[PDB]
Amino acid sequence: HVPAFLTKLWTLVSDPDTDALICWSPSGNSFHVFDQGQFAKEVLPKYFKHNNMASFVRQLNMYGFRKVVHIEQGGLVDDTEFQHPCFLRGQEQLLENIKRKV
Amino acid sequence: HVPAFLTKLWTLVSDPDTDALICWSPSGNSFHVFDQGQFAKEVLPKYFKHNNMASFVRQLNMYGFRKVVHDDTEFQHPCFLRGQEQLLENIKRKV
Amino acid sequence: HVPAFLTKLWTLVSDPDTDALICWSPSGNSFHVFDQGQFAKEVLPKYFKHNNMASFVRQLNMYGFRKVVHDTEFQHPCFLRGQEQLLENIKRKV
DNA sequence: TGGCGTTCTAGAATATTCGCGGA
DNA sequence: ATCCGCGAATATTCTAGAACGCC
Ligand code: NA
Ligand code: NA
Ligand code: NA
């Protein structure tokens, strides 16, 4: 049985209604979160028992997701991207192979 | 020498202009952050090289501050007291 | 995984828009920085969290870059124009 | 049971700053 | 006396540890 987090993350990323806040990348091999503040307060509590980005990020790391760093970050001058080799658009069956860390 | 984080943290908490986002508790044992999103994007980059709440929280734990369990986030350190800037000398950064 | 500093420095040197301040040498085995002060105040903070030339140089030394003795020229044997793949072999000091 | 979810804190690698020492 | 390269402390980012609850 696929854990609730992966099925919920799949649904909310794929949901076109939330695409303004969280959506697939063009390749469908990663997902973006735009405006962490709005995402955390409107989307997270509709799937999880919290509205905290840190608790969402902790879960992403627990399931082998890693942050994709953009070369545009790092300067003094809101787009957060995460990926997992088995989290691909149009391949929901692949979530069976994402195993949570012990 | 007191590290920049502590003097900046004392300054921004004590600043009455920011009291709507971050301010001392009534007794002044601790400080509250209201609306993490607006605080992180509007107050943090004016003191630090980032606008991210997670890096602020990481630094707080780095200096031994702990979250008091109850958008209202409260942190305390026994040597972070309103009107006692000299006490920051006793706050130890973890190595 | 190649550290941000090396990828950013590669972009900075190779970027033709910044060539007036930082660019490859003609042979492409080193890079020059012209007007160290102006470089520090306008190009550095758009790539790093500082506008400080000393902090740019400190990281260059952390990655084994050496100053070319003769505005300001730096070199690393694996920082070569047209060989971006070589940045994988630059090790940061411990 | 034991694996999962949420929270709060810490580890690890790189980044930025300051100042110094030997050449 | 100057200056390049470096040690060390702090800063920022991303990931992980640890405690506890709960079906
Ligand atoms: Na979506
Ligand atoms: Na304040
Ligand atoms: Na250039």
Author numbering:
A (entry chain B): 14 to 90, 95 to 119
B (entry chain A): 14 to 83, 95 to 119
C (entry chain C): 14 to 83, 96 to 119
From the paper:
Heat shock factor 1 (HSF1) and 2 (HSF2) play distinct but overlapping regulatory roles in maintaining cellular proteostasis or mediating cell differentiation and development. Upon activation, both HSFs trimerize and bind to heat shock elements (HSEs) present in the promoter region of target genes. Here, we present co-crystal structures of human HSF1 and HSF2 trimers bound to DNA, which reveal a triangular arrangement of the three DNA-binding domains (DBDs) with protein-protein interactions largely mediated by the wing domain.
Crystallization of the HSF1 trimer in complex with the same three-site HSE was unsuccessful until longer sticky-ended DNA duplexes were attempted. Two structures containing 23- and 24-bp oligonucleotides were determined and refined at 2.4 and 2.36 Å. Different from the HSF2 structure, two HSF1 trimers bound to two intact HSEs reside in the asymmetric unit in both structures, where the DNA duplexes were stacked in a head-to-head manner. As a consequence, the two HSF1 trimers are differently oriented with a large rotation angle between them, but little conformational discrepancies exist among all the HSF1-HSE copies present in both structures. Like HSF2, Arg117 (corresponding to Arg109 in HSF2) in the middle DBD (DBD II) also inserts into the major groove and forms a direct hydrogen bond with the nucleobase 5′ to TTC. For example, in the structure comprising 23-bp DNA, the C terminus of DBD II in the first trimer is rigidified by a close contact between Lys118 and the phosphate backbone of DNA but not in the other two DBDs. Particularly, the entire loop in an HSF1 trimer bound to the 23 bp DNA was visible and thus used for further analysis.
